[PDB]
RNA sequence: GCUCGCGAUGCGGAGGGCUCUGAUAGCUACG
RNA sequence: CGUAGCUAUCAGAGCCCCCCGCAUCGCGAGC
């Protein structure tokens, strides 16, 4: 018992409360300890849990790691063990994302800070870990409704936190390309190099890490957290409520007029989309025409971390993937929990999704049910807006520099199809899933990406 | 040693309370502390002397959503009357093993071979459910207080509210109607904070008044069993209880053979019980005839205080069922539907029970009372 | 007879904080 | 042999705080 051992180890220790926050089950107190001259702390929804984790941090830093809680143990990246000890990275990136969220909501006071799932992307450039940078912050645990889907690329289909965070990572990527391409002076400050095999690659040792307040829905979350001692089915988000249900191994594929007479919109679960990302990259098809594949190095969970189930959800379940195009791969990033994981607040989901990318001055708020911002407009994150960025980047890069031949681009879907190797990796991923007994990916009716900018 | 409805009601209440006392060291144990007491009493004839207490339980809480077990090791619902049914199930399994041991032991079993296939109760074996208060939901919600000759009947029998399916909600108070087009529960949704929903006891007892008290699995061995009486020790309201237990689903149709809409005797007792003072215990006790001692389960976790599975949990019941299954000759099964050994699938092998359950769900829907709210399917996807 | 909105008085499982009592456990102090 | 105290847990009676459909009455409107 942590404080008991800490006060039978250096028995004169006095604990300092700093700042209480929240209401009902969403409340947290911060507790601190001074022992052997080092300022420690933990977090917890009641005092005697925050103090317990503060004591655990003290004894970890001085003496030793406590109960080698066995599913609480982190897989490690195949390549890039560069940002030092996995727990120290995990705790750093969760703290960074929580701090940026605080800044973005009047120090957790704005009405938009009441959220169920927080998420974020954090960038490192160095083996040194003190030089991180929060790239994007998002919330949301909800999805557009059948009657609200856009044919003009003007509505966010998925507003779950992880997903919104990735779209903000795409906004950051377009900004970085435009930065490299606006001045020979600014090329030194872009995250991108000219690449030897063509187009752009990331400057060496630039890596991105993904934080989610909880485990992604679907497969990484199908376990009992109080008995950790197994069939990675593709699952789809149920419209209406939070949570997912497994893909039906035989049922008809969606079409645009069918989501308005008999059925709702079937969106893939966040586990599946992250697994997807671990093969095709986090940059999607359109960016791939300009840059070499980008993969996350870390998936840090602020709760419901379980090493086996997350391993399965994120890469192991599709180990059977074959013949990936060049530079694609089965990314096996670092997976970790955090120390003072947050608590389960049993309540109804918020209805808004918050997003912010580094560069912007303020968060943007989206009704996840209509995929529009709460006075009825298109998000900076939506299909149409990203495509607008992409068109502006295409206009500045010579026809030689492209990673794919695409000339005179008009329609979204066709510009996506121009990304031949990425579509190849997409097909390989789909087949891996089918052949593993895990169901077939549900794709949207291709009419909703059938739109020009005009 | 006679019959009269009020005589019977008082007799079963005395027996359950007395047996509870015997089990709790004359109510001096820390575990005697209870808000709600429930039990099952078995009769075999007209002599009140012949009544036998089968199970006793307490509890007023249900499992915390974070503690759901995907291996069937946790009790989901510790309201006393639900626990009392599960304890009776243990008894039913024991009685089948008694029948199967040998021809001499067979005489003592409450089961006999059935002419329709499988087994059925011997003539005049009856079970009676006792609850120290009105079951939550439809029977309880519109008057959660003791009745007085002065207060009228329900001044509003025709409100939409009357008869609706309702759920307990985790961290919520009261029970709630199912919403118009209420969306299905998911394992990952509950884990992330969607509040776990459980059907109210009023709704569960009505279900048992259609599909029987034995559950699906036992129905693979035995014909449907019904309560002959429901005895409340306090907060009796005749019109609400009668509506809740059956009258609300008098529109049910097309039940499979041997199923019926059972309308048991409903009664209060002559000397109504009192409110018990005290913060309500977070634990639940259970006992079945033949057990040496009570079992104490933390209702919020669904396991005992050392984290062990209850003798009443799904996994334990699946084990009892599997042992009997290996002993019953195929020609004696009531169903010959082969299904893979996963709790969910074995239940599906009880085809007629599933049909009766379907008629029940439909009765509620067509009556305007809402749709039954089931657990995430992942709950039952485990094997021994 | 209901249904909906607003108001009013009440009724019926969570989280958190401050006290009072009992039990265990570990560590001090003093005679 | 004691008393005193300090933490860590449990167990139990209090005081707040804060959440999360139903009853009774009134007003408006509708079926
Ligand atoms: O961030 P998400 O909400 O998960 O969006 C993705 C993304 O679409 P956009 O970038 O156009 O929004 C995928 O696009 P690419 O990765 O190919 O660039 C697209 O897949 P396809 O365009 O390859 O079909 C997929 O749609 P889906 O998998 O249903 O076809 C869609 O996810 P949602 O449709 O669920 O928003
Ligand atoms: O009396 P309870 O403790 O509430 O248990 C019942 C029982 O399940 P178990 O016997 O496995 O504990 C029902 O099973 P049947 O005997 O009726 O077949 C099951 O209904 P299903 O038939 O769908 O399994 C129902 O679960 P659900 O509420 O999802 O219908 C579940 O109730 P709880 O989940 O409330 O314990
Ligand atoms: Zn999700
Ligand atoms: Zn109940």
């Amino acid at each position: 018992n942590p404080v008991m051992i800490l006060n039978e180890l250096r028995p004169g220790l006095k604990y300092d409360f700093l700042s209480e926050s929240g209401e009902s089950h969403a409340k947290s107190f911060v507790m601190s300890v001074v022992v052997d001259g080092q300022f420690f702390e933990g977090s917890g929804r009641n005092k005697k849990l925050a103090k317990a984790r503060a004591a655990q941090s003290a004894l970890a830093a001085i003496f030793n790691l406590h109960l080698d809680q066995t599913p609480s143990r982190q897989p490690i990246p195949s390549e890039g063990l560069q940002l030092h000890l996995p727990q120290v990275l995990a705790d750093a990136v969760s703290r960074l994302v929580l701090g940026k969220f605080g800044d973005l909501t009047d120090n957790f006071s704005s009405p938009h800070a009441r959220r169920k799932v927080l998420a974020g992307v954090v960038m490192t450039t160095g083996t040194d870990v003190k030089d991180a940078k929060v790239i994007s912050v998002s919330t949301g645990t909800k999805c557009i409704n059948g009657e609200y889907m856009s044919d003009r690329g003007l509505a966010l289909n998925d507003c779950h936190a992880e997903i919104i965070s990735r779209r903000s990572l795409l906004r950051f990527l377009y900004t970085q390309l435009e930065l490299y391409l606006n001045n020979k002076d600014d090329q030194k400050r872009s995250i991108f190099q000219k690449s030897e095999r063509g187009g752009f690659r990331l400057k060496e040792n630039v890596q991105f890490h993904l934080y989610i307040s909880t485990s992604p829905c679907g497969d990484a979350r199908i376990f009992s957290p109080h008995e950790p001692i197994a069939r990675g089915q593709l699952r789809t988000k149920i419209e209406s409520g939070q949570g997912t249900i497994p893909v039906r191994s035989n049922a008809s594929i969606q079409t645009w007029d069918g989501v308005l007479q008999g059925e709702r919109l079937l969106t893939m679960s966040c586990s599946d989309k992250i697994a997807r990302w671990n093969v095709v990259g986090i940059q999607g098809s359109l960016l791939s025409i300009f840059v070499e594949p980008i993969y996350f190095s870390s998936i840090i969970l602020g709760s419901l971390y379980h090493g086996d189930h997350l391993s399965r959800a994120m890469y192991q379940r599709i180990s059977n993937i074959e013949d990936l195009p060049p530079l694609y791969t089965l990314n096996k990033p670092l997976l970790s929990g955090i120390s003072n994981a947050e608590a389960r607040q049993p309540g109804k989901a918020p209805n808004f999704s918050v997003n912010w990318t580094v560069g912007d001055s303020a968060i943007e708020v989206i009704n996840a049910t209509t995929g529009k911002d709460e006075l009825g407009r298109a998000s900076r994150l939506c299909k149409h807006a990203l495509y607008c960025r992409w068109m502006r980047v295409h206009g500045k890069v010579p026809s030689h520099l492209l990673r794919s031949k695409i000339t005179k681009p008009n329609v979204y879907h066709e510009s996506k199809l121009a990304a031949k190797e990425y579509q190849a990796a997409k097909a390989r991923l789909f087949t891996a899933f089918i052949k593993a007994g895990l169901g077939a990916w549900v794709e949207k009716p291709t009419e909703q990406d059938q739109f020009s900018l005009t």
Side-chain angles (χ1 to χ4, degrees), chain A residues 1-228 230-454:
Chain A
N1 198 264
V3 168
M4 145 217 171
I5 276 91
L6 177 66
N7 285 97
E8 73 170 338
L9 217 178
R10 275 77 170 105
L13 261 37
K14 271 65 191 173
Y15 303 89
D16 178 63
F17 153 82
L18 282 308
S19 291
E20 154 192 29
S21 325
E23 201 174 312
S24 298
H25 334 56
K27 169 163 273 180
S28 288
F29 315 99
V30 190
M31 295 290 296
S32 185
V33 80
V34 41
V35 42
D36 310 318
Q38 359 259 7
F39 180 99
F40 301 112
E41 84 194 38
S43 83
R45 71 154 184 201
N46 63 24
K47 283 165 55 170
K48 291 303 208 81
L49 177 75
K51 180 196 302 287
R53 286 148 153 186
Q56 255 164 344
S57 186
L59 311 166
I62 310 307
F63 317 96
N64 68 279
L65 48 142
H66 185 219
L67 281 192
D68 220 70
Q69 202 22 264
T70 125
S72 287
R73 300 275 68 100
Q74 30 282 73
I76 305 88
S78 294
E79 209 77 301
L81 273 70
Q82 305 187 31
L83 264 309
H84 290 281
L85 210 164
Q87 201 52 61
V88 325
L89 186 82
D91 278 319
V93 320
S94 46
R95 245 168 300 106
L96 269 162
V97 163
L98 238 147
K100 228 314 161 314
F101 193 45
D103 287 65
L104 287 172
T105 48
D106 300 25
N107 190 18
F108 307 114
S109 91
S110 134
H112 303 127
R114 56 122 197 287
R115 54 82 180 158
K116 208 108 279 145
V117 173
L118 166 60
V121 170
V122 170
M123 181 174 70
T124 69
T125 56
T127 68
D128 212 321
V129 205
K130 290 164 180 55
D131 44 337
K133 187 168 81 198
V134 180
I135 296 303
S136 65
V137 178
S138 88
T139 66
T141 164
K142 236 121 143 180
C143 262
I144 201 181
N145 301 109
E147 93 112 42
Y148 270 100
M149 178 172 52
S150 156
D151 50 63
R152 302 190 293 249
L154 289 175
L156 292 163
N157 284 172
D158 192 339
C159 279
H160 283 210
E162 314 83 302
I163 311 316
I164 300 297
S165 286
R166 194 200 61 98
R167 317 190 62 86
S168 319
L169 184 49
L170 301 172
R171 282 189 55 214
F172 174 55
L173 293 173
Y174 289 120
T175 296
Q176 291 295 312
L177 294 176
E178 272 145 2
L179 174 66
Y180 181 101
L181 294 162
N182 288 330
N183 234 266
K184 297 200 185 316
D185 231 77
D186 311 316
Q187 308 193 6
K188 80 183 199 72
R189 317 185 248 269
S190 178
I191 56 171
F192 283 107
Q193 268 170 337
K194 42 278 172 205
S195 167
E196 21 287 310
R197 304 128 252 173
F200 302 84
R201 84 178 214 263
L202 282 183
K203 276 175 201 169
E204 190 193 350
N205 282 11
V206 170
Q207 48 189 205
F208 300 98
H209 322 253
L210 164 66
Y211 174 77
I212 323 162
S213 98
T214 191
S215 193
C217 49
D219 199 66
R221 238 193 269 156
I222 317 303
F223 65 93
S224 316
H226 297 292
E227 331 165 313
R231 319 288 200 276
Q233 317 215 336
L234 290 187
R235 359 226 322 162
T236 53
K237 334 233 224 268
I238 91 245
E239 203 20 79
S240 320
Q242 333 154 26
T244 69
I245 236 58
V247 153
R248 18 275 314 115
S249 299
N250 194 267
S252 206
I253 185 60
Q254 288 200 131
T255 32
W256 177 275
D257 296 271
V259 302
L260 297 122
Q261 52 191 137
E263 43 150 6
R264 331 196 195 287
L265 265 170
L266 287 200
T267 293
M268 298 305 288
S269 86
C270 301
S271 283
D272 309 333
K273 306 217 197 177
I274 304 185
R276 164 157 180 154
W277 302 346
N278 279 323
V279 172
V280 304
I282 51 80
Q283 82 304 311
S285 54
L286 281 187
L287 260 162
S288 78
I289 303 174
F290 296 144
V291 308
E292 300 192 338
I294 309 196
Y295 293 99
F296 280 140
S297 315
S298 312
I299 301 152
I300 309 317
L301 300 198
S303 67
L304 285 180
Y305 175 92
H306 188 298
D308 305 341
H309 300 280
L310 189 69
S311 307
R312 166 173 86 263
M314 299 300 98
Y315 45 71
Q316 218 49 280
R317 68 192 164 126
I318 51 172
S319 54
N320 41 278
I321 177 149
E322 29 159 344
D323 292 308
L324 279 180
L327 321 125
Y328 300 92
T329 182
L330 190 68
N331 179 68
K332 294 148 174 287
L334 147 72
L335 324 173
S336 172
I338 64 183
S339 296
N340 13 237
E342 56 159 57
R344 165 156 181 280
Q345 301 154 6
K348 328 305 212 81
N351 221 22
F352 52 84
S353 151
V354 156
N355 64 80
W356 168 92
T357 327
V358 57
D360 319 293
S361 76
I363 61 159
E364 159 201 68
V365 175
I366 285 88
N367 189 344
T369 93
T370 79
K372 316 269 204 306
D373 96 319
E374 83 263 49
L375 65 189
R377 333 187 252 213
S379 152
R380 38 198 194 153
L381 257 46
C382 66
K383 258 153 181 163
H384 186 115
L386 267 15
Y387 192 46
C388 204
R389 293 299 287 288
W390 180 91
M391 201 76 81
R392 215 182 278 287
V393 174
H394 181 261
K396 247 175 314 176
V397 277
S399 192
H400 79 261
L401 225 268
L402 308 177
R403 281 189 81 255
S404 300
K405 185 77 164 198
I406 160 76
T407 36
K408 270 184 43 197
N410 180 31
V411 185
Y412 193 58
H413 185 45
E414 232 270 318
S415 316
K416 282 187 167 174
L417 290 181
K420 282 291 289 184
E421 338 156 47
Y422 172 102
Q423 304 288 337
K426 220 173 102 194
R428 285 329 95 60
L429 162 82
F430 292 165
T431 58
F433 269 127
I434 268 197
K435 269 174 180 192
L438 308 181
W441 196 272
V442 186
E443 270 177 291
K444 250 111 194 65
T446 324
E447 296 72 58
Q448 82 142 337
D449 295 10
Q450 270 271 134
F451 77 82
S452 3
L453 277 184
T454 167

